[model samples]
Target: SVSAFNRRWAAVILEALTRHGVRHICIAPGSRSTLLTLAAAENSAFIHHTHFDERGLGHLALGLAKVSKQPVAVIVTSGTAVANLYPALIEAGLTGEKLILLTADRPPELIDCGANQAIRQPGMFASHPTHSISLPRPTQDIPARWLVSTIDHALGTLHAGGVHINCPFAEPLMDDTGLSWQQRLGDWWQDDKPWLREAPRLESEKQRDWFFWRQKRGVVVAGRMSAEEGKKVALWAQTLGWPLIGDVLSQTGQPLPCADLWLGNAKATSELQQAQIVVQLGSSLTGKRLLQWQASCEPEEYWIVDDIEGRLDPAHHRGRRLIANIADWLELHPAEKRQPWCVEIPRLAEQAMQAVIARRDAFGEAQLAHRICDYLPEQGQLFVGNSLVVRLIDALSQLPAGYPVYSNRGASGIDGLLSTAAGVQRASGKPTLAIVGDLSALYDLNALALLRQVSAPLVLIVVNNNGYLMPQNVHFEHAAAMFELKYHRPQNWQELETAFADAWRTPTTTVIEMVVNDTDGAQTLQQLLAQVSHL
Candidate 1:
C-alpha cells in the first residue's frame, strides 16, 4: 500500500506553506503526520518546533501567530491528536488568531470500518476553521497544478480562524524512490507565483462612498495598527486633524507636532458622542467601558476599516465596512480640510488622562497596574496580558511613537501571555517585555519554557497583586467574597522566581519586588516604572 506519491506530495505542501510566508510550524508527532513533520524539518525556510502535547502545540501556534502577525501552522497526527487541538482551536476561532491546522489522517477508505485512529475528519472542523480543505490522496500522474491552486485558496482565506487541510496519506508514506526531493517538490511548487491576488485597490463604488463619508465626518480609531501602518495613519490623522484614539497597541505615542492630538488615554474618556462618524481599525479597543460606549451610540455612521471581509459586524448595516489596507486608505484618500470636531477630541482625551492620574492616588489593583505601566520600556514592545493588565495600561500608559503594544484582546482570555510575547520577540528580533498580573502569568507558566529559545532581551514584570482581580466578579456579594479569597490569599511570588529558574535553561531572569503603601508606594512605583520603560 506504500506509495512514493504520498511522501512527495507532503514535501510539496510543506514547501508551498513556506513560500506563502508561514515562518513557524508547531507539530505533535504521530505515525500519520510523519511525512509532514519530516518535510517541515528538512525545509530551510520554516522553523519547526516540536511539542509533546497537541493542545500545547495549538497554543504554540496561537502564540506564534499573535507575535508574528502572520499565520502559523499547527501540524498533528490524526485521531485524538486533532481533537486535542480543540481548546486552542476554539480560542483561535473566537480571538481571530491566524493559524493553520494541518492534520494527517488515514485515507478516506479507512474511516468507520473499525479503523484504529480514524474519525469523521472531513467536516469535523467545519465549525472552527475559517476554511477547510481535504486534500486528495497523492496518486499517480496527479496534476501538480491542482495542489498549487488548493494551497493558494487556503492561504488567501485567512483572517480570524484557523484553516484546516486534512491530508490523508496512503501507505509507503516515506519512500523517496531515488527522486531528488527538491525536484519532485519543485514540480508542485513551481516558481512562487502570487498565491494571493493583490487585494484590488479599494475602487468599488461602496468604497468610494465610504472614502467620501470618512473624509467628511469620520475620525480614525487606530486600535493596533502595525508600526509602519501606524506611522502612516498618524501622519494622515495629523494632516486631517482627525482625532486618533491610539489603542495601547497602535504605536502612536507622542503627539505629532502638526496635530499634536494623540488620544493616549481614551479609556478614561466619558463619551464619543461628539464625533458623527467612527472608523474602527486594527485590533479591538482595550477598555470594556469604551466598547460599551461605542456599542451604545448606534452612531449614524460606523465603519470598520480592514483588509479582510466578514469581519465587519453583520448585524449593524448602519455601520459601513471598508475592506482595504489601513495604510493604503491613508495614502489614497488624503483629507482636504481639517475638521474642528477632530481638534476637540484629543483635548477631551488629555482632560481624561489628567483625571485618571489624579484618581490613581486611591488604593486598588487598577491603581497598582497603572503605576506599573509607567515603568515599561518606551522604545520597544510592551506585551500586556489580558484581563485587568490591558485595561490598566490603556488608562495610564503613554508609549512613544513606534513602541508596539500587544494583547490577546480577540477572545480576551488569560492564557499564553509568555508564549505570545516570546513569539513576538522571535518574529521581530527586537527587545521585548511583558507586563503580566500574577494569575495570568501563572496560567501560562509553560511560556517560561521558551526562555532558551527566545533571542531578544525580555523583561517580565509580574504585578504580584496577590489575587485574581477579574471584572467578572461584579455582583456585590460575590465580588466581595471572591476578592477576599483570590486577592487576600497570601502567595509567594519569590518562590515563583525560583520555580522559573528551574524551568528555563537560558536567557537571564531578574525579579524585583516593590511594596506599595500610603506614602511612598506611589513615588517608588513611579520611579520603578520609569526605569523599566527605558529598557
Candidate 2:
C-alpha cells in the first residue's frame, strides 16, 4: 500500500509539473527513484529521457532547458546520484535555465544511521538551486492540498534557475493503495489547471529614451544569445550604422571575426574607442581582450541589455542594466540608419584573418579552429567546449550567419560538455558539431554513451594533446570501439577535413581525434598574438 501511495504522490507531482509547464523529464535508473520513473513513464504528456550517468542526465536536462526555455526536470535516486547534479545546477543558476531536480531519498529514519545508499539528503544542493524543498513521506495525514500548493509555491520561485524537490520514501517502496485522492481534491481533478495559480512577474519598464543614443557613435557587443536573437541585434546594429563585436557564443554570423587578434594592435583598439556609447546586448562574452578592453576603455555611457537579472559587466562598471528578452526589448526601440564609423577596424581585422590564412597550411589545434568555420555545415549547430579550443575558436573562427552556437559559459568547467552537446542535439533535432580539447573529452568519457542514441548527426571532435598529461600512449579509438561509435584519427589538414565531412554526413555519433603536439595550440596562439601586437 505504501508503494501505491508513493506512486500516487509521484503522479500528483508530475501532473503538477506539467501544469507548471514542464515537458521533458530526464531520469537516471535507481530503485529509490522507481515511483518517479514509473509516473513519468505512465504520463503521456512528458517526453521521457533516461541516462545511466546522473551527471550526464542533469546536463541533458540542462541542454533541453537551454533550448526549450522552460523548467526541465531530472529524476535521480538517493545518495551520490543526487550529488552528481551539482555542476549542472551551478550552470543553471548562473545562466538562468530552469532545471527541476526531483530526487528520491530514503525516509528520515534511514538517512543518518549509516544506511546504505543514503546520505544527508535534505539541503544537499546548498545554494545552487533557486529553491529547495524536502518533502515528508507520503501519507493521508498530510493534506493533498498541501502537496499541490507546496509545489506551486516552489515552482513560482523558479525563474531562470533550478528547484530541488527531495522526495523521501519509507520502506515498502512499492504497493497499491487502491484509492484515489481525486474526491478529496474535488474540482482540481476536473479543473485542468494548477490549484493555486500565480500571475507571472513582469519586469518593470525602464524610462530611458530608446532613440536618444541613435545618433551617437556607438558600438554593439553581442554575447551569448540564440541565433534569431543575434540576427535581430545584427539588424539593429546595421540600422544604427555601428560596428558589432560578437563573441563565439553570440552566433552573430562571425561579426568582426578575429576581433581578439586584431585588438592586439594599439591603433585598432584606439579606433574603436571613439564610441560615445557602448551597448552590450546579452552577456557571457568569451574573448579576454574584449573584456579587458571594455574594462579599461570606459565609454561615456555603457548600457547593457540582457534578460538575466544582475550585473552583466564583470568589472562592475557603471551601466544601465535592462532585464528583458532581447527581441522583445528591441521591438519597442526605433533607430535611424547612418554611415558606419570605425570602418578602419574591419581593415585591421582583415589583416588578422590574412595572417591566419597564410598559416592555415599547417595542421594544429589553432589551424583546426580556423578551418572549422568552413568545414561546419550551414544547417548544423555548434557547441564550443570551454578549453584551449574555445579560446582558439573565439580568436580564429568566423561562423556562417544565422548559425547558432551553444556552450556552458556559466561555470564553464571542462566536464559534461559531451553530454550537454548530446542533450542540445536531442532537443533541437538538428545535426550538431561539438569541439573540445583532449582532456575535456576524457573528462566526460562516459558521456560518449549519450551520443550513440542521438536522433541527428553528431560529430564530436576531440583535439587530443593529452592535456594535464595522462599516459602518453592513451588513445580514444578503443573507447569509441567500446561504444560502437564511428572513430577516426585525422593526421593532417586534409585528413581532418575528410574525417569531419564523413562524420557530418552520417546520422550516428562520430568521434574525430586530432592528435597534435601538446604545446601546439599555445605556441601558435602566442606567435599570432605577437604578430598582431603592432599591426
**What is the number of backbone collisions in each predicted candidate, taken in the order shown?**
7, 4
**What range of 10 consecutive residues in model 2 has the weakest lDDT sum?**
174-183
**Candidate 2 lDDT over residue span 191-295, tens digit each:** 667888864864637536666777888889998987898888888888888888888888787667788888778887888778788888899888778878888
Per-model TM-score versus the true fold: 0.76, 0.95
lDDT of 1: 0.61
Candidate 1: tens digits of C-alpha lDDT, residues 1-535: 3556676677778877776578888886687789888878888778777656576667777877876768889898989899877766776776567788899988878889998888888877668877888888677456554675688777764555788889898854635642553354443345555344332333322356645565565566677666677777777776676666666677776352111122222422323455677767765666544455555655578877766555555346386666666777666666555654544455554554554465565444445555543445435567777755456566565666676766666666676666666666666665566766666656765555553365655666555544566563111223213222111121334443343343233343332322223334334334333332222
RMSD (CA, Å), each prediction:
8.4, 2.2
Off by over 4 Å in 1: 1-3, 87-97, 113-115, 156-161, 171-190, 194-218, 254-274, 311-317, 337-339, 342-348, 358-364, 371-374, 464-535
lDDT of each: 0.61, 0.83
